[PDB]
PDB file of C-alpha atoms and ligand atoms in Angstrom:
ATOM      1  CA  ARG A 155       0.174 -95.477  49.844  1.00  0.00           C
ATOM      2  CA  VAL A 156       3.594 -94.138  49.375  1.00  0.00           C
ATOM      3  CA  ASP A 157       6.839 -95.724  50.473  1.00  0.00           C
ATOM      4  CA  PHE A 158       8.571 -94.823  53.749  1.00  0.00           C
ATOM      5  CA  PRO A 159      11.755 -92.890  52.900  1.00  0.00           C
ATOM      6  CA  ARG A 160      14.216 -95.627  52.890  1.00  0.00           C
ATOM      7  CA  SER A 161      17.087 -92.939  53.175  1.00  0.00           C
ATOM      8  CA  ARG A 162      15.857 -92.130  56.773  1.00  0.00           C
ATOM      9  CA  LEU A 163      16.441 -95.648  58.031  1.00  0.00           C
ATOM     10  CA  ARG A 164      19.913 -95.657  59.771  1.00  0.00           C
ATOM     11  CA  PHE A 165      21.449 -99.084  60.485  1.00  0.00           C
ATOM     12  CA  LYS A 166      22.225 -99.872  64.109  1.00  0.00           C
ATOM     13  CA  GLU A 167      22.569-103.566  64.494  1.00  0.00           C
ATOM     14  CA  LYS A 168      21.359-106.814  62.996  1.00  0.00           C
ATOM     15  CA  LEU A 169      18.491-108.378  64.868  1.00  0.00           C
ATOM     16  CA  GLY A 170      18.130-111.558  62.732  1.00  0.00           C
ATOM     17  CA  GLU A 171      19.615-113.440  59.820  1.00  0.00           C
ATOM     18  CA  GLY A 172      17.082-115.189  57.508  1.00  0.00           C
ATOM     19  CA  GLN A 173      17.289-117.526  54.638  1.00  0.00           C
ATOM     20  CA  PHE A 174      16.395-114.789  52.133  1.00  0.00           C
ATOM     21  CA  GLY A 175      16.860-111.631  54.121  1.00  0.00           C
ATOM     22  CA  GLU A 176      17.730-109.962  57.381  1.00  0.00           C
ATOM     23  CA  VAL A 177      15.983-107.930  60.178  1.00  0.00           C
ATOM     24  CA  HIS A 178      17.784-104.744  61.231  1.00  0.00           C
ATOM     25  CA  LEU A 179      17.466-102.421  64.099  1.00  0.00           C
ATOM     26  CA  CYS A 180      17.464 -98.896  62.591  1.00  0.00           C
ATOM     27  CA  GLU A 181      17.095 -95.398  63.950  1.00  0.00           C
ATOM     28  CA  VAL A 182      14.854 -93.025  61.975  1.00  0.00           C
ATOM     29  CA  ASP A 183      16.642 -89.784  61.066  1.00  0.00           C
ATOM     30  CA  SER A 184      14.723 -86.654  61.772  1.00  0.00           C
ATOM     31  CA  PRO A 185      11.516 -88.522  62.547  1.00  0.00           C
ATOM     32  CA  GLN A 186       9.226 -85.488  63.300  1.00  0.00           C
ATOM     33  CA  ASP A 187       9.251 -84.831  59.489  1.00  0.00           C
ATOM     34  CA  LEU A 188       7.316 -88.225  58.867  1.00  0.00           C
ATOM     35  CA  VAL A 189       4.743 -88.528  61.715  1.00  0.00           C
ATOM     36  CA  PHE A 190       3.668 -93.005  59.289  1.00  0.00           C
ATOM     37  CA  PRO A 191       2.406 -93.761  62.747  1.00  0.00           C
ATOM     38  CA  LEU A 192       5.776 -93.080  64.504  1.00  0.00           C
ATOM     39  CA  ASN A 193       5.709 -92.832  68.303  1.00  0.00           C
ATOM     40  CA  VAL A 194       8.442 -90.249  68.874  1.00  0.00           C
ATOM     41  CA  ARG A 195       9.558 -88.943  72.107  1.00  0.00           C
ATOM     42  CA  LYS A 196      11.052 -85.539  71.252  1.00  0.00           C
ATOM     43  CA  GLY A 197      14.829 -85.574  71.040  1.00  0.00           C
ATOM     44  CA  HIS A 198      15.123 -89.351  71.722  1.00  0.00           C
ATOM     45  CA  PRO A 199      15.971 -92.082  69.166  1.00  0.00           C
ATOM     46  CA  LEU A 200      13.050 -93.559  67.294  1.00  0.00           C
ATOM     47  CA  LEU A 201      14.021 -97.179  66.911  1.00  0.00           C
ATOM     48  CA  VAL A 202      12.355 -99.505  64.451  1.00  0.00           C
ATOM     49  CA  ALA A 203      12.796-103.090  63.222  1.00  0.00           C
ATOM     50  CA  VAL A 204      13.036-103.503  59.441  1.00  0.00           C
ATOM     51  CA  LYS A 205      12.625-106.909  57.634  1.00  0.00           C
ATOM     52  CA  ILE A 206      14.454-106.788  54.370  1.00  0.00           C
ATOM     53  CA  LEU A 207      14.497-109.060  51.438  1.00  0.00           C
ATOM     54  CA  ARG A 208      17.865-109.612  49.889  1.00  0.00           C
ATOM     55  CA  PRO A 209      17.788-108.063  46.330  1.00  0.00           C
ATOM     56  CA  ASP A 210      19.300-111.239  44.907  1.00  0.00           C
ATOM     57  CA  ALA A 211      16.911-113.597  46.740  1.00  0.00           C
ATOM     58  CA  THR A 212      15.071-115.961  44.317  1.00  0.00           C
ATOM     59  CA  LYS A 213      12.010-115.068  42.548  1.00  0.00           C
ATOM     60  CA  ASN A 214      10.132-117.624  44.785  1.00  0.00           C
ATOM     61  CA  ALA A 215      11.415-115.649  48.004  1.00  0.00           C
ATOM     62  CA  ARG A 216      10.358-112.341  46.593  1.00  0.00           C
ATOM     63  CA  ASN A 217       6.896-113.704  45.692  1.00  0.00           C
ATOM     64  CA  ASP A 218       6.545-114.959  49.221  1.00  0.00           C
ATOM     65  CA  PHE A 219       7.637-111.598  50.575  1.00  0.00           C
ATOM     66  CA  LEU A 220       5.167-109.627  48.538  1.00  0.00           C
ATOM     67  CA  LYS A 221       2.391-111.929  49.958  1.00  0.00           C
ATOM     68  CA  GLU A 222       3.716-111.198  53.431  1.00  0.00           C
ATOM     69  CA  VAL A 223       3.338-107.439  52.748  1.00  0.00           C
ATOM     70  CA  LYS A 224      -0.307-108.011  51.726  1.00  0.00           C
ATOM     71  CA  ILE A 225      -0.978-109.868  54.882  1.00  0.00           C
ATOM     72  CA  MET A 226       0.831-107.486  57.275  1.00  0.00           C
ATOM     73  CA  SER A 227      -0.936-104.478  55.715  1.00  0.00           C
ATOM     74  CA  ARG A 228      -4.129-105.678  57.289  1.00  0.00           C
ATOM     75  CA  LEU A 229      -2.827-106.041  60.954  1.00  0.00           C
ATOM     76  CA  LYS A 230      -3.725-103.128  63.053  1.00  0.00           C
ATOM     77  CA  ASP A 231      -3.820-104.300  66.797  1.00  0.00           C
ATOM     78  CA  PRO A 232      -1.806-103.283  69.756  1.00  0.00           C
ATOM     79  CA  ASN A 233      -0.798-106.954  70.502  1.00  0.00           C
ATOM     80  CA  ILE A 234       0.132-107.858  66.853  1.00  0.00           C
ATOM     81  CA  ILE A 235       3.239-106.535  64.898  1.00  0.00           C
ATOM     82  CA  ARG A 236       1.996-103.433  63.004  1.00  0.00           C
ATOM     83  CA  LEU A 237       3.602-101.971  59.898  1.00  0.00           C
ATOM     84  CA  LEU A 238       4.754 -98.501  60.359  1.00  0.00           C
ATOM     85  CA  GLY A 239       5.712 -98.309  56.663  1.00  0.00           C
ATOM     86  CA  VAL A 240       7.084-100.176  53.660  1.00  0.00           C
ATOM     87  CA  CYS A 241       9.637 -99.675  51.062  1.00  0.00           C
ATOM     88  CA  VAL A 242       8.446-101.719  48.059  1.00  0.00           C
ATOM     89  CA  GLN A 243       8.557 -99.518  45.003  1.00  0.00           C
ATOM     90  CA  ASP A 244      12.312-100.223  44.711  1.00  0.00           C
ATOM     91  CA  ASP A 245      14.720-102.738  46.181  1.00  0.00           C
ATOM     92  CA  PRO A 246      15.392-103.893  48.677  1.00  0.00           C
ATOM     93  CA  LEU A 247      11.906-104.693  49.678  1.00  0.00           C
ATOM     94  CA  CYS A 248      11.340-103.812  53.463  1.00  0.00           C
ATOM     95  CA  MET A 249       8.708-103.769  56.057  1.00  0.00           C
ATOM     96  CA  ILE A 250       9.059-101.425  59.096  1.00  0.00           C
ATOM     97  CA  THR A 251       7.682-101.937  62.616  1.00  0.00           C
ATOM     98  CA  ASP A 252       8.161-100.893  66.195  1.00  0.00           C
ATOM     99  CA  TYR A 253      11.267-102.042  68.017  1.00  0.00           C
ATOM    100  CA  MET A 254      10.513-104.328  70.919  1.00  0.00           C
ATOM    101  CA  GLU A 255      13.456-103.940  73.165  1.00  0.00           C
ATOM    102  CA  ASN A 256      13.392-107.228  75.175  1.00  0.00           C
ATOM    103  CA  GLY A 257      13.310-109.693  72.225  1.00  0.00           C
ATOM    104  CA  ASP A 258      11.408-112.924  71.991  1.00  0.00           C
ATOM    105  CA  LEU A 259       9.293-113.952  74.892  1.00  0.00           C
ATOM    106  CA  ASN A 260      10.714-117.350  75.276  1.00  0.00           C
ATOM    107  CA  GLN A 261      14.263-116.014  75.900  1.00  0.00           C
ATOM    108  CA  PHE A 262      12.911-113.207  77.914  1.00  0.00           C
ATOM    109  CA  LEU A 263      10.768-115.160  80.309  1.00  0.00           C
ATOM    110  CA  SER A 264      13.193-118.038  80.902  1.00  0.00           C
ATOM    111  CA  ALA A 265      15.537-115.763  82.665  1.00  0.00           C
ATOM    112  CA  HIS A 266      12.783-115.116  85.255  1.00  0.00           C
ATOM    113  CA  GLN A 267      11.577-117.321  88.210  1.00  0.00           C
ATOM    114  CA  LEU A 268       8.134-116.978  89.808  1.00  0.00           C
ATOM    115  CA  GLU A 269       8.314-114.366  92.710  1.00  0.00           C
ATOM    116  CA  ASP A 270       8.606-116.016  96.119  1.00  0.00           C
ATOM    117  CA  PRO A 271      14.834-111.551  88.010  1.00  0.00           C
ATOM    118  CA  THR A 272      11.504-112.538  89.131  1.00  0.00           C
ATOM    119  CA  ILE A 273       7.914-112.134  87.810  1.00  0.00           C
ATOM    120  CA  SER A 274       4.632-112.233  89.691  1.00  0.00           C
ATOM    121  CA  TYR A 275       1.619-114.418  88.907  1.00  0.00           C
ATOM    122  CA  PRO A 276      -0.601-111.488  87.990  1.00  0.00           C
ATOM    123  CA  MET A 277       2.180-110.332  85.587  1.00  0.00           C
ATOM    124  CA  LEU A 278       2.223-113.864  83.944  1.00  0.00           C
ATOM    125  CA  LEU A 279      -1.627-113.575  83.433  1.00  0.00           C
ATOM    126  CA  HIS A 280      -1.122-110.098  81.947  1.00  0.00           C
ATOM    127  CA  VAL A 281       1.288-111.559  79.465  1.00  0.00           C
ATOM    128  CA  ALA A 282      -1.134-114.345  78.572  1.00  0.00           C
ATOM    129  CA  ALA A 283      -4.098-111.834  78.404  1.00  0.00           C
ATOM    130  CA  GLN A 284      -2.148-109.851  75.816  1.00  0.00           C
ATOM    131  CA  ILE A 285      -1.521-112.839  73.601  1.00  0.00           C
ATOM    132  CA  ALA A 286      -5.203-113.733  73.880  1.00  0.00           C
ATOM    133  CA  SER A 287      -6.083-110.238  72.843  1.00  0.00           C
ATOM    134  CA  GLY A 288      -3.898-110.338  69.898  1.00  0.00           C
ATOM    135  CA  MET A 289      -5.348-113.797  68.842  1.00  0.00           C
ATOM    136  CA  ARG A 290      -8.832-112.480  69.453  1.00  0.00           C
ATOM    137  CA  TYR A 291      -8.035-109.671  66.824  1.00  0.00           C
ATOM    138  CA  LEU A 292      -6.678-112.194  64.253  1.00  0.00           C
ATOM    139  CA  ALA A 293      -9.811-114.284  64.757  1.00  0.00           C
ATOM    140  CA  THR A 294     -11.970-111.374  63.629  1.00  0.00           C
ATOM    141  CA  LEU A 295      -9.923-111.145  60.524  1.00  0.00           C
ATOM    142  CA  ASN A 296     -10.321-114.912  59.848  1.00  0.00           C
ATOM    143  CA  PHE A 297      -6.636-115.153  59.994  1.00  0.00           C
ATOM    144  CA  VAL A 298      -5.028-118.396  61.158  1.00  0.00           C
ATOM    145  CA  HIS A 299      -1.577-117.842  62.625  1.00  0.00           C
ATOM    146  CA  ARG A 300      -0.567-121.726  62.585  1.00  0.00           C
ATOM    147  CA  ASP A 301       2.659-121.151  64.619  1.00  0.00           C
ATOM    148  CA  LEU A 302       1.620-119.516  67.958  1.00  0.00           C
ATOM    149  CA  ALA A 303       4.310-120.157  70.642  1.00  0.00           C
ATOM    150  CA  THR A 304       6.190-118.045  73.065  1.00  0.00           C
ATOM    151  CA  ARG A 305       9.219-118.108  70.575  1.00  0.00           C
ATOM    152  CA  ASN A 306       7.022-116.127  68.271  1.00  0.00           C
ATOM    153  CA  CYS A 307       6.033-113.347  70.718  1.00  0.00           C
ATOM    154  CA  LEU A 308       7.969-110.176  71.239  1.00  0.00           C
ATOM    155  CA  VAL A 309       8.519-108.179  74.456  1.00  0.00           C
ATOM    156  CA  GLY A 310       8.706-104.433  74.783  1.00  0.00           C
ATOM    157  CA  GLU A 311       8.698-102.166  77.851  1.00  0.00           C
ATOM    158  CA  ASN A 312       6.510-102.988  80.978  1.00  0.00           C
ATOM    159  CA  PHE A 313       5.757-106.482  79.816  1.00  0.00           C
ATOM    160  CA  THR A 314       3.990-105.479  76.692  1.00  0.00           C
ATOM    161  CA  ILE A 315       3.568-108.340  74.181  1.00  0.00           C
ATOM    162  CA  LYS A 316       3.148-108.466  70.491  1.00  0.00           C
ATOM    163  CA  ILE A 317       2.618-111.643  68.407  1.00  0.00           C
ATOM    164  CA  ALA A 318       4.946-112.083  65.405  1.00  0.00           C
ATOM    165  CA  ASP A 319       5.917-115.009  63.115  1.00  0.00           C
ATOM    166  CA  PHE A 320       9.813-115.581  62.825  1.00  0.00           C
ATOM    167  CA  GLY A 321       9.270-118.650  60.706  1.00  0.00           C
ATOM    168  CA  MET A 322      10.644-122.011  61.368  1.00  0.00           C
ATOM    169  CA  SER A 323      14.383-121.864  60.663  1.00  0.00           C
ATOM    170  CA  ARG A 324      15.984-120.256  63.748  1.00  0.00           C
ATOM    171  CA  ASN A 325      18.674-122.735  65.104  1.00  0.00           C
ATOM    172  CA  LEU A 326      17.735-121.832  68.756  1.00  0.00           C
ATOM    173  CA  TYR A 327      14.284-123.340  68.218  1.00  0.00           C
ATOM    174  CA  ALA A 328      15.065-126.151  65.750  1.00  0.00           C
ATOM    175  CA  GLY A 329      14.045-128.775  68.307  1.00  0.00           C
ATOM    176  CA  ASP A 330      10.455-127.257  68.323  1.00  0.00           C
ATOM    177  CA  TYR A 331       9.982-128.337  64.517  1.00  0.00           C
ATOM    178  CA  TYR A 332       9.544-131.668  63.026  1.00  0.00           C
ATOM    179  CA  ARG A 333      11.169-132.103  59.638  1.00  0.00           C
ATOM    180  CA  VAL A 334      10.450-134.741  57.017  1.00  0.00           C
ATOM    181  CA  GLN A 335      11.851-134.656  53.430  1.00  0.00           C
ATOM    182  CA  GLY A 336       9.259-133.106  51.067  1.00  0.00           C
ATOM    183  CA  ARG A 337       6.895-132.111  53.781  1.00  0.00           C
ATOM    184  CA  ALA A 338       6.041-128.905  55.541  1.00  0.00           C
ATOM    185  CA  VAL A 339       8.113-128.125  58.742  1.00  0.00           C
ATOM    186  CA  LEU A 340       5.737-128.622  61.623  1.00  0.00           C
ATOM    187  CA  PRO A 341       5.490-127.332  65.290  1.00  0.00           C
ATOM    188  CA  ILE A 342       4.054-130.665  66.392  1.00  0.00           C
ATOM    189  CA  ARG A 343       4.279-129.998  70.120  1.00  0.00           C
ATOM    190  CA  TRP A 344       1.938-126.958  69.691  1.00  0.00           C
ATOM    191  CA  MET A 345      -0.375-128.561  67.151  1.00  0.00           C
ATOM    192  CA  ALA A 346      -4.041-129.909  67.698  1.00  0.00           C
ATOM    193  CA  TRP A 347      -4.477-133.476  66.866  1.00  0.00           C
ATOM    194  CA  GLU A 348      -6.314-132.653  63.602  1.00  0.00           C
ATOM    195  CA  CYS A 349      -3.530-130.286  62.396  1.00  0.00           C
ATOM    196  CA  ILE A 350      -1.209-133.436  62.883  1.00  0.00           C
ATOM    197  CA  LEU A 351      -3.451-136.040  61.279  1.00  0.00           C
ATOM    198  CA  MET A 352      -5.322-133.996  58.717  1.00  0.00           C
ATOM    199  CA  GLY A 353      -3.389-130.780  58.184  1.00  0.00           C
ATOM    200  CA  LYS A 354      -6.474-128.868  59.233  1.00  0.00           C
ATOM    201  CA  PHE A 355      -5.421-125.326  60.588  1.00  0.00           C
ATOM    202  CA  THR A 356      -8.255-123.222  61.862  1.00  0.00           C
ATOM    203  CA  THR A 357      -8.914-120.660  64.556  1.00  0.00           C
ATOM    204  CA  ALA A 358      -9.805-123.671  66.883  1.00  0.00           C
ATOM    205  CA  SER A 359      -6.394-125.102  66.369  1.00  0.00           C
ATOM    206  CA  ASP A 360      -4.928-121.577  67.250  1.00  0.00           C
ATOM    207  CA  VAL A 361      -6.810-121.938  70.386  1.00  0.00           C
ATOM    208  CA  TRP A 362      -5.118-125.223  71.136  1.00  0.00           C
ATOM    209  CA  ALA A 363      -1.717-123.761  70.375  1.00  0.00           C
ATOM    210  CA  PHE A 364      -2.703-120.779  72.691  1.00  0.00           C
ATOM    211  CA  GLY A 365      -3.322-123.431  75.486  1.00  0.00           C
ATOM    212  CA  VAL A 366       0.157-124.657  74.855  1.00  0.00           C
ATOM    213  CA  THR A 367       1.581-121.096  74.779  1.00  0.00           C
ATOM    214  CA  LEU A 368      -0.170-120.367  78.099  1.00  0.00           C
ATOM    215  CA  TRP A 369       1.383-123.517  79.559  1.00  0.00           C
ATOM    216  CA  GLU A 370       4.768-122.256  78.413  1.00  0.00           C
ATOM    217  CA  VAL A 371       4.226-118.862  80.127  1.00  0.00           C
ATOM    218  CA  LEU A 372       3.181-120.665  83.439  1.00  0.00           C
ATOM    219  CA  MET A 373       6.340-122.842  83.084  1.00  0.00           C
ATOM    220  CA  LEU A 374       8.310-119.489  82.756  1.00  0.00           C
ATOM    221  CA  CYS A 375       9.523-120.870  79.361  1.00  0.00           C
ATOM    222  CA  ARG A 376      11.912-123.300  81.084  1.00  0.00           C
ATOM    223  CA  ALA A 377      10.392-126.469  79.596  1.00  0.00           C
ATOM    224  CA  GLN A 378       9.442-127.808  76.271  1.00  0.00           C
ATOM    225  CA  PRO A 379       5.925-128.974  75.807  1.00  0.00           C
ATOM    226  CA  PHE A 380       5.843-132.825  76.123  1.00  0.00           C
ATOM    227  CA  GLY A 381       9.510-132.487  76.693  1.00  0.00           C
ATOM    228  CA  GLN A 382      10.096-136.005  77.938  1.00  0.00           C
ATOM    229  CA  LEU A 383       8.357-137.541  75.000  1.00  0.00           C
ATOM    230  CA  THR A 384       9.841-138.075  71.440  1.00  0.00           C
ATOM    231  CA  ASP A 385       8.558-136.444  68.302  1.00  0.00           C
ATOM    232  CA  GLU A 386       7.147-139.883  67.414  1.00  0.00           C
ATOM    233  CA  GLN A 387       5.303-140.119  70.559  1.00  0.00           C
ATOM    234  CA  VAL A 388       3.739-136.716  70.149  1.00  0.00           C
ATOM    235  CA  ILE A 389       2.495-137.679  66.730  1.00  0.00           C
ATOM    236  CA  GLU A 390       1.255-140.956  68.141  1.00  0.00           C
ATOM    237  CA  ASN A 391      -0.554-138.919  70.846  1.00  0.00           C
ATOM    238  CA  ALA A 392      -2.442-137.030  68.104  1.00  0.00           C
ATOM    239  CA  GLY A 393      -3.738-140.429  67.050  1.00  0.00           C
ATOM    240  CA  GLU A 394      -4.822-141.230  70.431  1.00  0.00           C
ATOM    241  CA  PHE A 395      -6.975-138.118  70.560  1.00  0.00           C
ATOM    242  CA  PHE A 396      -8.627-139.230  67.258  1.00  0.00           C
ATOM    243  CA  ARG A 397      -9.263-142.725  68.522  1.00  0.00           C
ATOM    244  CA  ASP A 398     -10.731-141.290  71.670  1.00  0.00           C
ATOM    245  CA  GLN A 399     -10.292-144.356  73.890  1.00  0.00           C
ATOM    246  CA  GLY A 400      -8.866-142.500  76.954  1.00  0.00           C
ATOM    247  CA  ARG A 401      -5.207-142.944  76.167  1.00  0.00           C
ATOM    248  CA  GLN A 402      -4.413-139.416  74.955  1.00  0.00           C
ATOM    249  CA  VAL A 403      -2.185-137.388  77.240  1.00  0.00           C
ATOM    250  CA  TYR A 404      -1.953-133.638  78.057  1.00  0.00           C
ATOM    251  CA  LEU A 405       0.567-131.254  79.395  1.00  0.00           C
ATOM    252  CA  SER A 406       0.859-131.390  83.076  1.00  0.00           C
ATOM    253  CA  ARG A 407      -0.190-128.656  85.449  1.00  0.00           C
ATOM    254  CA  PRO A 408       2.613-126.211  85.999  1.00  0.00           C
ATOM    255  CA  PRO A 409       3.551-125.355  89.555  1.00  0.00           C
ATOM    256  CA  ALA A 410       2.690-121.818  89.037  1.00  0.00           C
ATOM    257  CA  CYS A 411      -0.797-122.674  87.664  1.00  0.00           C
ATOM    258  CA  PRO A 412      -3.986-122.962  89.840  1.00  0.00           C
ATOM    259  CA  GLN A 413      -6.341-125.663  89.037  1.00  0.00           C
ATOM    260  CA  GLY A 414      -9.033-123.307  87.697  1.00  0.00           C
ATOM    261  CA  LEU A 415      -6.498-121.936  85.180  1.00  0.00           C
ATOM    262  CA  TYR A 416      -5.386-125.486  84.253  1.00  0.00           C
ATOM    263  CA  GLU A 417      -9.115-126.313  83.481  1.00  0.00           C
ATOM    264  CA  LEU A 418      -9.095-123.295  80.987  1.00  0.00           C
ATOM    265  CA  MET A 419      -5.961-125.135  79.326  1.00  0.00           C
ATOM    266  CA  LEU A 420      -7.755-128.241  79.163  1.00  0.00           C
ATOM    267  CA  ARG A 421     -10.649-126.610  77.380  1.00  0.00           C
ATOM    268  CA  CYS A 422      -8.263-125.362  74.788  1.00  0.00           C
ATOM    269  CA  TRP A 423      -7.217-129.021  74.256  1.00  0.00           C
ATOM    270  CA  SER A 424     -10.770-130.343  73.703  1.00  0.00           C
ATOM    271  CA  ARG A 425     -11.026-133.036  71.251  1.00  0.00           C
ATOM    272  CA  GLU A 426     -13.774-131.342  69.230  1.00  0.00           C
ATOM    273  CA  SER A 427     -12.568-128.182  67.707  1.00  0.00           C
ATOM    274  CA  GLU A 428     -16.016-126.557  68.102  1.00  0.00           C
ATOM    275  CA  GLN A 429     -15.875-127.017  71.960  1.00  0.00           C
ATOM    276  CA  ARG A 430     -12.686-125.149  72.460  1.00  0.00           C
ATOM    277  CA  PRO A 431     -13.401-121.640  73.953  1.00  0.00           C
ATOM    278  CA  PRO A 432     -13.152-118.646  71.647  1.00  0.00           C
ATOM    279  CA  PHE A 433     -10.371-116.077  72.111  1.00  0.00           C
ATOM    280  CA  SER A 434     -12.880-113.544  73.303  1.00  0.00           C
ATOM    281  CA  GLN A 435     -13.706-115.732  76.347  1.00  0.00           C
ATOM    282  CA  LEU A 436      -9.970-116.688  76.987  1.00  0.00           C
ATOM    283  CA  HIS A 437      -9.037-112.991  77.028  1.00  0.00           C
ATOM    284  CA  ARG A 438     -11.972-112.208  79.366  1.00  0.00           C
ATOM    285  CA  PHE A 439     -10.977-114.985  81.699  1.00  0.00           C
ATOM    286  CA  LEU A 440      -7.341-114.094  81.931  1.00  0.00           C
ATOM    287  CA  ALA A 441      -7.993-110.387  82.062  1.00  0.00           C
ATOM    288  CA  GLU A 442     -10.385-110.625  85.063  1.00  0.00           C
ATOM    289  CA  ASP A 443      -7.999-113.057  86.866  1.00  0.00           C
TER     290      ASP A 443
HETATM  291  O1  D6Z B 557       4.914-110.361  62.694  1.00  0.00           O
HETATM  292  C1  D6Z B 557       4.830-111.087  61.673  1.00  0.00           C
HETATM  293  C2  D6Z B 557       6.089-111.373  60.867  1.00  0.00           C
HETATM  294  N1  D6Z B 557       7.158-110.723  61.111  1.00  0.00           N
HETATM  295  C3  D6Z B 557       8.057-111.015  62.124  1.00  0.00           C
HETATM  296  O2  D6Z B 557       8.069-111.988  62.719  1.00  0.00           O
HETATM  297  C4  D6Z B 557       9.153-109.858  62.264  1.00  0.00           C
HETATM  298  C5  D6Z B 557       9.278-109.349  63.700  1.00  0.00           C
HETATM  299  C6  D6Z B 557      10.079-110.315  64.512  1.00  0.00           C
HETATM  300  N2  D6Z B 557      11.375-110.682  63.764  1.00  0.00           N
HETATM  301  C7  D6Z B 557      12.633-110.304  64.170  1.00  0.00           C
HETATM  302  O3  D6Z B 557      13.657-110.716  63.773  1.00  0.00           O
HETATM  303  C8  D6Z B 557      12.763-109.390  65.500  1.00  0.00           C
HETATM  304  C9  D6Z B 557      13.637-109.765  66.477  1.00  0.00           C
HETATM  305  C10 D6Z B 557      13.692-108.935  67.500  1.00  0.00           C
HETATM  306  C11 D6Z B 557      12.865-107.777  67.520  1.00  0.00           C
HETATM  307  N3  D6Z B 557      12.709-106.551  68.420  1.00  0.00           N
HETATM  308  N4  D6Z B 557      11.893-105.735  67.920  1.00  0.00           N
HETATM  309  C12 D6Z B 557      11.367-106.262  66.759  1.00  0.00           C
HETATM  310  C13 D6Z B 557      12.007-107.474  66.454  1.00  0.00           C
HETATM  311  N5  D6Z B 557      11.979-108.351  65.467  1.00  0.00           N
HETATM  312  C14 D6Z B 557      11.068-111.489  62.578  1.00  0.00           C
HETATM  313  C15 D6Z B 557      10.462-110.440  61.604  1.00  0.00           C
HETATM  314  C16 D6Z B 557       8.519-108.858  61.228  1.00  0.00           C
HETATM  315  C17 D6Z B 557       8.962-107.578  60.862  1.00  0.00           C
HETATM  316 BR1  D6Z B 557      10.583-106.822  61.697  1.00  0.00          BR
HETATM  317  C18 D6Z B 557       8.378-106.772  59.935  1.00  0.00           C
HETATM  318  C19 D6Z B 557       7.198-107.420  59.367  1.00  0.00           C
HETATM  319  C20 D6Z B 557       6.647-108.661  59.745  1.00  0.00           C
HETATM  320  C21 D6Z B 557       7.495-109.351  60.608  1.00  0.00           C
HETATM  321  N6  D6Z B 557       3.560-111.620  61.280  1.00  0.00           N
HETATM  322  C22 D6Z B 557       2.381-111.208  61.970  1.00  0.00           C
HETATM  323  C23 D6Z B 557       1.638-112.388  62.600  1.00  0.00           C
HETATM  324  F1  D6Z B 557       1.562-113.357  61.742  1.00  0.00           F
HETATM  325  F2  D6Z B 557       2.304-112.945  63.565  1.00  0.00           F
HETATM  326  F3  D6Z B 557       0.528-112.041  63.037  1.00  0.00           F
HETATM  327 CL1   CL B 558      16.689-100.993  53.988  1.00  0.00          CL
HETATM  328 CL1   CL B 559      -2.185-100.547  66.954  1.00  0.00          CL
HETATM  329 CL1   CL B 560      10.357-120.479  88.403  1.00  0.00          CL
HETATM  330 CL1   CL B 561       6.407-108.437  88.192  1.00  0.00          CL
END
């Protein structure tokens, strides 16, 4: 219940610039003194990522950061960001996690093509299975992510995946969010129809977003969901799911995706939230395959 020693965090480079803070890549000085679940290979650099709140950030930003610490303090799964430690008794407030050396999954995967930098079909399924495993864990906690997408996943060594949540402000992904003055920013292309129409976010809407995330993976992250349709058309499509007159449209089957796997995606996009498969089944399907 004690702070990680802030003085042992040695800056190396900036990983991200946020509205109210920054994420740094740091080395941990003399880490064997602290093992704090640090995974140290003797005499090698222990690299960590540190999310830091600017000390002069607004009171509201500090309040939101303190709530994030509370949420993050519960998350203990190999496929979700895990806290190695925090520095919160004094400023700047910080949260420390393992460094994932290959960055976000969208940028990582889009450099690859399906093997004839390549990636095999079984490896794509292994990536997707890890995401499903992380979401399965969140579901056991009754924790709704609300923004699952490949841009919010991180890649480490050997295609290991962890689910994160960068928020909605990065310029690189601005086109993935729908902005209206005075409203929440919304990842409409990943959202179940009931999220769009009623603002109802649940584990079942996380399953829908998982279907879209799986589609992205099988597209090698080289296409945006519903990419030829306008934001207005995507919102209109949510209405068609509600109306249930056969005019709703779905993401198409990726070239890399067999029909059986596409049918799993379609189950994730069931109109009725209760008919969507649970993450325990999605993981089993993908891990067997
Ligand atoms: O994970 C979170 C929220 N959260 C993040 O998103 C990040 C990690 C990713 N990030 C980065 O800037 C970045 C970029 C390249 C990187 N390489 N290696 C690490 C790394 N980080 C944003 C900040 C973070 C840290 Br750090 C500490 C504590 C929480 C978080 N929430 C859990 C759930 F909701 F999703 F389940
Ligand atoms: Cl710091
Ligand atoms: Cl863990
Ligand atoms: Cl390809
Ligand atoms: Cl591979």
